[PDB]
Amino acid sequence: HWGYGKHNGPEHWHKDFPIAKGERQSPVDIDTHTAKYDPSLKPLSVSYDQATSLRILNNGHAFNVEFDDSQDKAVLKGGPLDGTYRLIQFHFHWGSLDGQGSEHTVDKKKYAAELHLVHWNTKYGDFGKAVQQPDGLAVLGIFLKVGSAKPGLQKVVDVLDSIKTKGKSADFTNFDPRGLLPESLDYWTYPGSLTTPPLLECVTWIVLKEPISVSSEQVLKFRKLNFNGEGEPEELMVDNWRPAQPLKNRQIKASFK
Ligand SMILES: O=C(O)c1ccccc1[S@@](=O)Cc1ccccc1
Ligand SMILES: [Zn+2]
């Protein structure tokens, strides 16, 4: 099915998922001069102290760190959000080279990777129902640049050898996602979509302005994963990012001056 190759990549997705050419697709380029500070935005609250991670899975597209969302533990609220959004999983998008990898861009600048912490609106009961709603999801996006190592990312890096191929998973309990955040919570926000099929238009995007630094050795290990399953020809999991989509009738708001 879909992927990131010449034959099944982003340019082909619209044939099975027509919403790929929709009115609120993600990612987008964030033009900093056009984004406007919004006084109506409330303070952003990232409450991950009670987070309960469970497993890490190579799904043939990226790797997902999954959480127990059966209760209000790790939640995101405030900012542009109405209500409480529960963390369900996080994953990354990255490149084959440090000059590319992120999905959102900032004044056309591409970062080496991008972290997505996916949350669903608790008013909808479960993730499946939330993805049938225009305000069903909130994704916290964080850029990664190559420089100093990110200590809080090392546990993820070290388990990747165990889930090299599509379909493999490993226990991944007691992981603290607080260790993946930058110091500042300044952000840009706009209404968009999931960046992977089915590309559903249910996401309030909150993209942090401050990138986190990770080491070249850390990202190099992301690039050793495989898109293929065990026993199949090796196709390195790199460049699993969708490029910027038309902004159309949308405005990007900034939480800062
Ligand atoms: O799929 C991609 O994203 C992809 C990206 C770049 C080059 C090739 C591919 S697919 O041919 C690899 C693949 C996937 C699943 C099972 C076996 C093989
Ligand atoms: Zn993503």
The Cα–Cα gap between 6 and 223 comes to 18
- Residue ranges of alpha helices (H) inside 76-141 are 127-130
Q: What angle do CA 6, 246, 240 make, to 5 degrees?
A: 35
The Cα–Cα gap between 134 and 141 comes to 18
Question: Is the distance from the beta carbon of residue 3 to the nearest atom of ligand 1 less than 6 Å?
Answer: yes
Q: Give the ligand 1 atom nearest the CA of 61.
A: 3
In 3D space, the residue among 68, 94, 256 whose CA is nearest the CA of residue 174 turns out to be 68
Task: Check if the beta carbon of residue 142 is closer than 8 Å to that of residue 181.
Answer: yes
Residue 148 CA to ligand 2 centre (angstroms): 23
The token pair that represents 65 in the structure block:
């760190």
The strand pair at 137-146 and 44-47 is best described as unpaired
Instruction: Residue 253: give its domain's CATH number.
Output: 3.10.200.10
Residue 56 CA to ligand 1 centre (angstroms): 20
Task: Check if the beta carbon of residue 37 is closer than 8 Å to that of residue 256.
Answer: yes
Three-class SS state of 249:
coil
- Eight-state DSSP code of residue 191: E
The Cα–Cα gap between 88 and 167 comes to 19
- Eight-state DSSP code of residue 229: P
The Cα–Cα gap between 21 and 10 comes to 11
Q: How was this structure determined?
A: X-ray
The residue type of 31 is D
Say if residue 143 is exposed, middle or buried (CB neighbours under 10 Å; 0-12, 13-18, 19+). Answer: buried
Task: Check if the beta carbon of residue 48 is closer than 8 Å to that of residue 74.
Answer: yes
Query: How distant, in Å, are the alpha carbons of 29, 173, 210, 252, 254 from that of 34?
Result: 11, 42, 18, 8, 10
52 annotated ligand binder: no
Catalytic residue status for 61: yes
In order, the DSSP letters of 21-85 are: GSSS-S--EE-TTT-EE-TTPPPEEEE-TT--EEEEEE-SSSEEEEE--SSS-SEEEETT--S-E
The Cα–Cα gap between 201 and 250 comes to 13
| Number of other residues whose CB lies within 10 A of the CB of residue 229 | 13
Residue 202 CA to ligand 2 centre (angstroms): 13
| Number of other residues whose CB lies within 10 A of the CB of residue 220 | 12
Instruction: Give residue for tokens 């209760």.
Output: 71
Say if residue 37 is exposed, middle or buried (CB neighbours under 10 Å; 0-12, 13-18, 19+). Answer: exposed
Can you give the residue range of the structural domain that contains 53? 1-257
The Cα–Cα gap between 41 and 80 comes to 6
- Looking at 33, 61, 104, 119, which residue is catalytic? 61
- What total of structural domains would you count in the chain? 1
Q: What is the dihedral of CA 86, 38, 29, 22, to 10 degrees?
A: 70
In 3D space, the residue among 78, 90, 84 whose CA is nearest the CA of residue 206 turns out to be 78
Helix (H) or strand (E) holding 105: strand 105-106
Three-class SS state of 152:
helix
Count Cα neighbours of 56 within 13 Å in the Cβ-side half-sphere. Answer: 22
